[PDB]
Amino acid sequence: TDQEKRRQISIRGIVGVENVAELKKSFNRHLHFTLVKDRNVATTRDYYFALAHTVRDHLVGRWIRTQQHYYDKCPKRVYYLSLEFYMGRTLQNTMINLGLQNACDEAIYQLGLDIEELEEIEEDAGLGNGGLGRLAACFLDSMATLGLAAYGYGIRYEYGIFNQKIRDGWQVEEADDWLRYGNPWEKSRPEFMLPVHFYGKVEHTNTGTKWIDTQVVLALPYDTPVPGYMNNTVNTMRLWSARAPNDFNLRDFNVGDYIQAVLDRNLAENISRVLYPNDNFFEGKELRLKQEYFVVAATLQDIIRRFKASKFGSTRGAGTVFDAFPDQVAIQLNDTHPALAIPELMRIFVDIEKLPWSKAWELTQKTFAYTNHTVLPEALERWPVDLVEKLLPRHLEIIYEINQKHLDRIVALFPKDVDRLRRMSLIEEEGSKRINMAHLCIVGSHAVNGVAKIHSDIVKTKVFKDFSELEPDKFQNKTNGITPRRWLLLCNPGLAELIAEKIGEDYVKDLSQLTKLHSFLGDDVFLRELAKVKQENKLKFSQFLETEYKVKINPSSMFDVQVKRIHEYKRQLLNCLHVITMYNRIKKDPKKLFVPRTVIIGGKAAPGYHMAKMIIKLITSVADVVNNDPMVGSKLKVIFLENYRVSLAEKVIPATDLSEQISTAGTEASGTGNMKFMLNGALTIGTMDGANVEMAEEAGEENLFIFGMRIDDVAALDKKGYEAKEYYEALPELKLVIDQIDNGFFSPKQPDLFKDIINMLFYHDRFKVFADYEAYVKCQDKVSQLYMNPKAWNTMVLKNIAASGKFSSDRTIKEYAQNIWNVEPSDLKISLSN
Amino acid sequence: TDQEKRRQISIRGIVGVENVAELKKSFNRHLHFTLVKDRNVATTRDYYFALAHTVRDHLVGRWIRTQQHYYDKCPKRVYYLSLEFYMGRTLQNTMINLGLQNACDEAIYQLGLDIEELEEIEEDAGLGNGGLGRLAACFLDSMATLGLAAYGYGIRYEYGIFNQKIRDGWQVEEADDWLRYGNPWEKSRPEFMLPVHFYGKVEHTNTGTKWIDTQVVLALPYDTPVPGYMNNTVNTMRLWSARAPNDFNLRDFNVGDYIQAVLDRNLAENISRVLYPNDNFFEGKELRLKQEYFVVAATLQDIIRRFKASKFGSTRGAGTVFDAFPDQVAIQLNDTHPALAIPELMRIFVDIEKLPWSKAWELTQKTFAYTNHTVLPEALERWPVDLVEKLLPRHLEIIYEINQKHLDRIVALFPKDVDRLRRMSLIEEEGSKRINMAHLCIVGSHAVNGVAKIHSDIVKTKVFKDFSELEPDKFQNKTNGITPRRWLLLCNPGLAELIAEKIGEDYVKDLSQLTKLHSFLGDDVFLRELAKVKQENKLKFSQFLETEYKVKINPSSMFDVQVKRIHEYKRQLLNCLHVITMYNRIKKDPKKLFVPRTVIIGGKAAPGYHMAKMIIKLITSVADVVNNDPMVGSKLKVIFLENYRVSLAEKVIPATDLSEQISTAGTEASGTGNMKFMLNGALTIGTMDGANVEMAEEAGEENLFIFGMRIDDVAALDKKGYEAKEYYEALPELKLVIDQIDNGFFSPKQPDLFKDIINMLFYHDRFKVFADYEAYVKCQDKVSQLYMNPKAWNTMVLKNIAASGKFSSDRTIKEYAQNIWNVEPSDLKISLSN
Ligand SMILES: Nc1ncnc2c1ncn2[C@@H]1O[C@H](COP(=O)(O)O)[C@@H](O)[C@H]1O
Ligand SMILES: Nc1ncnc2c1ncn2[C@@H]1O[C@H](COP(=O)(O)O)[C@@H](O)[C@H]1O
Ligand SMILES: *Cc1c(COP(=O)(O)O)cnc(C)c1O
Ligand SMILES: *Cc1c(COP(=O)(O)O)cnc(C)c1O
Ligand SMILES: OC[C@H]1O[C@H](O)[C@H](O)[C@@H](O)[C@@H]1O
Ligand SMILES: OC[C@H]1O[C@H](O)[C@H](O)[C@@H](O)[C@@H]1O
């Protein structure tokens, strides 16, 4: 059942040939044979899927070769654990990284199709929600580009979080059914489903501790290949889908119990139903825990499986096959969501593999590395021990014994320090016992890191003081990055081509090389092209806006964008204050010079966030007024981008001129979007916090439009009293605006509509909108005047783009690989024809 | 969005080349690219799917060409409506009809795989249940072989009916989850879902009658290509799958209503969940109606769609585009299950198309043709008008107005005949109003037919007397048939090759040509080969039995099989009586000559059928005794085939010698299995009823082992009194057997186990087991003695096989095409290279 005849089963011949003739033959086989269609009945969506599958074959051939190489060389594998993967679309990104765009373009042209039309058919993968997930997505691209044997592990959300739609000015959430017509980029593995247990009880027997009487839930993996840039290296993203062990009971169907018959089906599937389910109640709270354990349990079993199966893996040789585990496995804990992976690995090791608790714990710590994204201690994930006790009984035991061994050594260094114990314990004993998941992640990992220089510092010294003191070397910093593939070459082929036409192409895999663009700082002919590229990107986006919004867009306008989640700390209300202000200024009397701007605000509000949704309605109302006002005209146009997401980001970003990063000082750890704009040719107007800080250190604070209170100033005010009533009367323009909002200038049908935004802004604010108002508008006026001089604007732009090179995720990954995972990057190209 | 460049989208190049080199290349592309596997991790199931997809491409290329031809020539299309499609497996049958078996064999051999092993991986399509569905399946193969533009329409049952498993002697039903790993032969059409309404209310407006306030259920079609024999003609079988319009409510998920959120999902999916759901209660009863309407509603919409889209179809030209409808469409109503198609087509025509009721009714009748399978009037499908009124309100109205127009003309021919009205009305007014579905099918069709000569006669004259009298020409006969592809060439390649080695290959598409085998009746050298072929088939099946049952099988044994549904009228209990009898005879004292037999009994019992299940347990108990009895040995072995189905039928049938068709006289209309055995080289022992009748007329009653009471004899006894107590004492051997059963000879642990089979056999029988007992055993002894003389046995066998030619489904289809559908068969081969 083997032989050398079975060597005929290979990709040897069917891999490598990627000319236009073969791409046409493949398109035809997929259109007709895979889709069971023909040119007479085929839809646009069918031609898209035919292109997707054609490209996928090239992708999968390289994935097979990549994985065969990993098995042969048996390197240390990196497993990126994240409850969020903001992947976006896959077609064009795959074509670029595999270098197929040119050929496919010609092929699809010869077939009589419009490739740009096939491309827009694709849905954004409903697998992510924001920056945490997009970081993971950029990391995947980087680890593949850096030749690392890395994996992406998460949950396959059937419906993601939701899609945003704006009807009648307000936000209405829709179910993101991205899978309605299927996903040609994934591949389910029905023959490989892992059991995930829940509830039950512990039974300490003679031959060990047993977790019995449980409810099993199957994890069905879906594999999607992640391609590296031009290196033939394609890695794996494996997402789990919840399924019941027996999705149909025949006995119940014969009795008429049509709900019972498929009862286990629903319960299990709720797990992978949506991303971040409403936790405002036990039911939804318990589901997040189930989702967290689900990813953990299934992922770990898979890792152990592949480990044992590895070349040098398993046996006796091997004394204990797991002695070399941390030398062959590295698991990155993105945030605290997968914190359960620590007790679980311990459960597998001790209960199933029968290894000594002490031996397993040693192995465990060397395996896990924790990443803190949220610097706020009030925002650290906690779980009621009661909830864990019910759902994961054997797991509560392990968290206690882990904690017991943690505290015992603290008194073995602080025998009198009774307060350091309760301050460092995993459990918080109060009128409801909770479990600090960040503490678990810290004690259970060999490394911990923040996402920015000051973020990591606050993490190391402030928040986890009593932890870093015990072991300084554990805490690190890994400043976030962005992939220059999807964020430059893909989204902005114009800029990427201009940059390469001057300094070659080595910048793509070595972004820091962008400093060589300074040798054109004096060149005005280049800056001509540079600004020309931005106008190209602006013409195309203007069309998008006109078609999708039916709003006349001034192409010569500025393009002032602020795209991110709608939240109070993110401000955007402050942006709206300035918008009304510019409107009022125009209303003063025309003729006065006013540099035209296109104020685009985008983002999604949380379902149970009243303030955020009012702010959306507030912006839309302002927009309707200033866009229809005959006086204003092509001077100021306000646009609220509906359903802002990865694909849309790729659209607006290369068309932006002014990046709005105006969050209150002291509320931002990093700023992934900030870096994207910088790289694309936009000037940044933003507070000196989060990402802006390090961007300033690279280009020069002089090159960014820093404004408002610094973190010190805010803490200074959070000691005296922020009475919003003051700035109101003190400031002229502010008064007018605020009044217009409260009197119903922007809401004639319902003047008391924004009544709630007023009361909060004054007597109940928290992020000081008014305190930075005046400071914000003056800063903006400096942007407007700078925008009046092209050379001055572009010279600063080139300064930003030329200093963005360190914000590449390749750099970040090089750091994680070097300082945390102990993995060495590689530039070698996987051979398809070995 | 067209051009002549789009002509590049074609199968021109990728269709036709089917050598071994290309079959290997395709296997590799599917194994690696479709399955995302390699030879290092690929399972047997993966290699199967890779072969299936490879073969499927050849299949789909011909389907595309076939359908493109149908559009071009625009012939009249036949739509076969059946709630059951017993398809079995598809791999090998597809290879034979497309002539790929040879090449694939070599290719798979060069890949180092065992093709027989890949083949057994495939599951039987859980789409059928018995003869009604297998008839439809054979018809599909025949219509494709006969070049007819025919379609198969039904429901895609997610779990079929159930799979049978015998544990501890009894029958236990299991959920037939044939789709667990997917079906590579089907193709869903998510972009084409048809709405199916339920409940609601009627609203007679100004502009027509409206059916409002309904509950929509989506019908998602799954397309599977049905290949014709060596003619490049591949037709379509389209099965509908129930889906909810909105399978997920986000609003409910945020509130924690995890059942509500996916509430509509379950309700809709129950429809296509299982075949023949338990109707013993309103819930299950209402579901069968929903299933019946579901197939109807979706199928008709599809037919209208394709009709309008047809070449000569739609417009004005066309005055009324539907004037030519019955000249372009023919819909066959297999049984009364799809009876709802009559009122529905009327609903579409009148309400939606706005055609005059009279004009629509004319069109309707010319479109439908009804097929009666059940001759019993007590078994005619009836529906409570109350149930229809709730579920399909607009439909009850139409059934009444159809009936009103039916009865009004009866008094316009029988103005005083008050009893003929209530006797011919669609509705039965009683202490619960019911609707006769057969009457609806008759009034709504232009043709009606029985499945056998006497069956159709009883249908024409007895049961539907007052209908045929009104219009004689409506009622016809179409004797059932069997396809010689799956039932000779596929299952018995040995016999098929022997038959062709003497009379060529024209017999495959013209089975009647089998009379030319008589020119070998005197040849003993041929009969040598003939019997050799049966021993070959017997050696292979013996292995199957030993491996699967762990029972030593005597290869020289007879192989006495009776495979069919376990039912009282089917007898098999009578067969068990004889089995015990042969056992007792051996127990008399050894040495006495007893021709060795392998008594194989197979079939499935209905879940709520107590008697049938006892009979299974009865047979198994007998088996355990006579198989373990040291005295008996390789003289008599009893086997009960677990989960008897199409694939198993293909296995045992070519290995049988004695076909048991012993059902009580007057309880069988046809006999599809009977014909299968006859064609394969088995002698038939059976009552003179159903299928045996016409087989006798072809080979000669002299050539079949006719026994027991005739239909006249039984009716003679059903006038005096069948006191089973008589034969009991009167017959020696019977007494012994019956007593052994009642005293617990075959059930020492529970002697009173068969106590219920005794009481029923005596005081509550209905099919006269004892009355035919003596007559049955003597007949059997004649089989045994004949079996002692090879030449005599084979000479009769050749007589059976040589006379089976008329039992081909090609003949039956030729008749339906000629006398009912008004469609002309064709021998022309579809050109792949046009
Ligand atoms: N024993 C092996 N030899 C070679 N390649 C392997 C082996 N096991 C796994 N691979 C490769 O790894 C891919 C992913 O496999 P796994 O790591 O088992 O999930 C497979 O499709 C193979 O291409
Ligand atoms: N307008 C058309 N011209 C040619 N072939 C057609 C056309 N419409 C349908 N067909 C063929 O019929 C197959 C089944 O289509 P339909 O009858 O639309 O279900 C399609 O895949 C085509 O191969
Ligand atoms: C980059 C990106 C983000 C980043 O998160 P912030 O915290 O908002 O910077 C979020 N959403 C999308 C669509 C992005 O592309
Ligand atoms: C042919 C066949 C039948 C035919 O039905 P009967 O009424 O039993 O002759 C039933 N089941 C299978 C598996 C068959 O192949
Ligand atoms: O600015 C984007 C940010 O999005 C999320 O908050 C991530 O957790 C953070 O690491 C990232 O920097
Ligand atoms: O013998 C097989 C029989 O199976 C079913 O009863 C069919 O309805 C009938 O037409 C067929 O003849």
Answer yes or no: is the C-beta of A602 below 6 A from any ligand 3 atom.
Answer: no
Closest listed residue to residue A486, CA positions, set A55, A62, A135, A92 = A92
Q: Amino acid letter at B772?
A: D
Of all protein residues, the one whose alpha carbon is nearest to atom 12 of ligand 2 is: B67
Q: Return the SS3 of A703.
A: helix
Q: Helix/strand/coil (H, E, C) string of A124-186?
A: CECCCCCHHHHHHHHHHHHHHHCCCCEEEEEECCCCCCCEEEEECCEEEEECCCCCCCCCCCC
Query: Using alpha carbons only, what angle is made at residue B467 by residues B461 and B468, rounded to the nearest 5 degrees?
Result: 50
Determine the Cα–Cα distance for residues B635 and A389; give it in Å rounded to an integer: 64
Token pair recorded at residue B168: 């501890």
Tokens linked to B378: 């007590």
One-letter amino acid identity for B802? Answer: A
Distance CA B269, CA B266 (A): 5
Q: Say if CB A401 and CB A300 are below 8 A apart.
A: no
The Cα–Cα gap between A644 and A647 comes to 8
Q: Nearest to residue A173, comparing CAs of A275, A282, A288, A86?
A: A275
Beta bridge mates, A661: A686
Name residues contacting ligand 2 (CB within 6 A).
A 37-38, 40-41; B 64, 67-68, 71, 306
User: φ and ψ at A791, to 5 degrees?
Assistant: -55, -45
Structure tokens at A158: 């059937």
Distance separating alpha carbons of residues B760 and A725, to the nearest angstrom: 96
- The rounded distance, in Å, linking the Cα atoms of B220 and B195 is 9
What is the rounded (10 degree) CA torsion for A223, A227, A233, A237? -30
Q: Is A373 a catalytic residue?
A: yes
Decide: B727 and B773 in contact? Cβ < 8 Å.
Answer: yes
Q: Give kind and range of the element (H or E) at residue A292.
A: helix A282-309
Q: A732-762 burial by CB neighbour count: b if 16+ within 10 A, else e?
A: ebbebbbebbbebbbbeeeeebbeebbebbb
CA of A701 to the centre of ligand 2 (A): 64
Q: Locate all alpha helices (DSSP H) within B458-609, ordered by sequence.
A: 465-468, 493-503, 524-549, 573-588
Give Cα B539 to chain centroid, integer Å: 28
**By the 8 A CB rule, do B758 and B742 touch?**
yes
Q: State which H helix or E strand residue B387 sits in.
A: helix B385-391
How far is the CA of A128 from the CAs of A156, A603, A604, in angstroms?
10, 14, 13
Tally of CA atoms within 13 A in the half-sphere of A202 that contains its CB: 15
Helical axes B769-787 vs B573-588, angle rounded to 10°: 60
Q: What are phi and psi of A237, to 5 degrees?
A: -115, 115
Query: How far does the centroid of ligand 1 lie from the alpha carbon of residue B40, in Å?
Result: 6
Three-class DSSP category at A452: coil
Q: How far is CA A370 from CA A300, A378, A464, A721, in A?
A: 16, 18, 13, 38
The ligand 2 atom nearest the CA atom of B64: 23
Interatomic CA distance for residues A726 and A266, integer angstroms: 56
The rounded distance, in Å, linking the Cα atoms of A606 and B633 is 78
- Helices (DSSP H) in B175-281: which residue ranges? 250-255, 263-270
CA distance A600 to A111: 38
| Nearest residue to B823 (alpha-carbon basis) of B61, B147, B33 | B147
Question: B213 phi and psi, to 5 degrees?
Answer: 60, 30
Cα A330 from Cα A324, distance rounded (Å): 11
Q: Which of A134, A670, A675, A809 to mutate to test the pocket of ligand 3 (most atoms within 8 A of CB)?
A: A134
Among A432, A342, A442, which Cα is nearest to A389's? Answer: A432
Question: Could you tell me if A692 and A674 are in contact, meaning their C-beta atoms sit under 8 angstroms apart?
Answer: yes
> What 3-state class would DSSP assign to A323?
coil
CB atoms within 10 A of CB A778: 10
Neighbours of B372 (CB within 10 A): 25
Return the ∠ at Cα A615 (arms to A613 and A620), rounded to 5°. 100
Contacts of A160 in chain B (CB under 8 A): none
Residue A295 contacts residue A83 (beta carbons within 8 Å): yes
| Assigned token pair, A267 | 């319960």
Rounded Cα gap, residues B312 and B174, in angstroms: 50
Max Cα-Cα span within chain A: 90
**Residue A186: closest CA among A118, A237, A124:** A237
**Cβ-proximal residues to B773 (8 Å cutoff; 6+ apart), any chain:** B574, B577, B578, B727, B731, B734
The size of chain A, in residues, is 834
Please give the C-alpha separations between residue B751 and each of B171, B748, B773, in angstroms, as whole numbers.
19, 6, 23
CA–CA separation, B447 vs B466, rounded Å? Answer: 15
Query: What's the DSSP call for residue A513?
Result: G
Full DSSP string of A83-110: S----B--HHHHHHHTT-HHHHHHHHHH
Question: How many beta carbons lie within 10 A of that of residue A285, not counting itself?
Answer: 17
Closest Cβ–Cβ partner in B180, B248, B255 for A175: B248
Give the span between the Cα atoms of B400 and B598, in whole angstroms. 56
CA-to-CA separations, A470 to A412, A638, B144, in angstroms, rounded? 12, 53, 80
Q: Ligand 4 atom closest to Cα of B564?
A: 8
CA dist B514 → B511, B672, B799 (Å): 6, 18, 10
CA dist., res. A437 & res. A434, Å (int) = 9
Sequence letter at residue A301: Q
B63 vs B67: CA distance, rounded Å:
6
Q: To the nearest whole angstrom, how far is the Cα of A8 from the nearest Cα of chain B?
A: 5
- To which residue do tokens 């864990």 refer? A388
Question: Whole-angstrom Cα distance, residue A811 to residue A790?
Answer: 32
Residue type, A272: S
Collapsing DSSP to helix, strand or coil, B475 comes out as strand
Q: How was this structure determined?
A: X-ray
Cα separation, B555 vs B553, whole angstroms: 6
Q: Which 3-state string (H, E, C) describes A405-431? A: HHHHHHCCCCCCCHHHHHHHCCEECCC
How crowded is the C-beta side of A261, counted as CA atoms within 13 Å? 19
B278/A250 Cβ within 8 A: no
Q: Is B572 helix (H, G, I), strand (E, B) or coil?
A: coil
Residue B520 main-chain phi, psi, to 5 deg: -135, 5
Q: What angle do CA A620, A626, A629 make, to 5 degrees?
A: 135
**Does residue B41's CB lie within 6 angstroms of at least one atom of ligand 1?**
yes
Chain A positions touching B284 (Cβ under 8 A) are 256
Give, rounded to a whole angstrom, the gap between the first and last alpha carbons of chain A.
25
Domains present along chain A, CATH in parentheses: 6-481+809-832 (3.40.50.2000), 482-808 (3.40.50.2000)
Q: Rounded distance, CA A212 to CA A378, Å?
A: 36
B166/chain A closest Cα distance in angstroms: 16
CB A391 within 8 Å of CB A199: yes
Distance (Å, rounded) from C-alpha A219 to C-alpha A299? 9
* Integer CA distances (angstroms), A713 to A718, A722, B551, in order: 9, 12, 90
Return the DSSP state at A646: H
Report d(CA B762, CA B721) in Å as an integer: 12
Q: Does A6 sit within 8 Å of B60, measured CB to CB?
A: no
Question: Could you tell me the two tokens for A460?
Answer: 């190391």
Give the DSSP H/E element, type plus range, for residue B59. Answer: helix B44-73
For residue B647, what is the DSSP state? H
Q: After which residues is chain A broken (C to N over 2.5 A)?
A: none
The Cα–Cα gap between B497 and B483 comes to 17
CB-count exposure of residue A591 (10 Å: 0-12, 13-18, 19+): exposed
Q: Is A198 left (phi over 0), alpha (psi -120 to 50) or beta?
A: beta
Which helix (H) or strand (E) segment is B211 a member of? strand B208-212
Tell me the nearest-neighbour CA distance from B246 into chain A, angstroms: 10
Tokens representing A556 are: 């010569």
CB A342 within 8 A of CB A398: no
Closest Cα to residue A209, out of A317, A358, A346? A346
Tell whether A163 is in a known binding site.
no
d(CA B639, CA B649): 15
Size of interface A-B (CB pairs under 8 A): 196
CA-proximal residue: ligand 5, atom 3 (nearest):
A131
Q: For residues B270 and B276, what is the distance between their CA atoms, to the nearest angstrom?
A: 12
Q: How far apart are CA A224 and CA A221, in angstroms?
A: 10
Q: In angstroms, what is the C-alpha Rg of chain A?
A: 28
In our burial notation (b when 16+ CB lie closer than 10 A, e otherwise), range B164-179 reads beeeebebebebbbbb
Q: Which two tokens stand for residue B650?
A: 């293909």
Torsion of CA B719, B661, B337, B379, to 10 degrees: 10
**What is the C-alpha to C-alpha distance for residues B168 and B166, in angstroms, rounded to an integer?**
7
Q: Where are the beta strands (DSSP E) in A724-774?
A: none
SS (H, E, C) A781-820: HHHHHHHCCHHHHHHHHHHHHCCHHHHEHHHHHHHHHHHC
d(CA A252, CA B284): 12
Environment class of residue A97 by beta-carbon count within 10 Å: exposed (0-12), middle (13-18) or buried (19+)? buried
Measured CA to CA, the distance from residue A751 to residue A757 in angstroms comes to 12
Was A238 annotated as part of a binding site? no
| Rounded alpha-carbon distances, angstroms, from residue B597 to A220, A660, A752 | 49, 90, 95
Residues on chain B touching A250 (C-beta within 8 angstroms): 159, 162, 173-175, 274
Minimal-distance CA residue of chain A relative to B25: A14
The helix or strand, by DSSP H or E, that contains position A223, with its residue range, turns out to be strand A215-227
| Residues A526, A536: Cα–Cα separation, whole Å | 15
Rounded CA separation B426/A104 (Å): 63
Q: How many H helices and E strands in chain B?
A: 32, 23
Rounded Cα distance between B353 and B670, Å, is: 41
Residue in B695, B725, B727, B728 with CA at minimum distance from that of residue B709: B727
d(CA B740, CA B576): 12
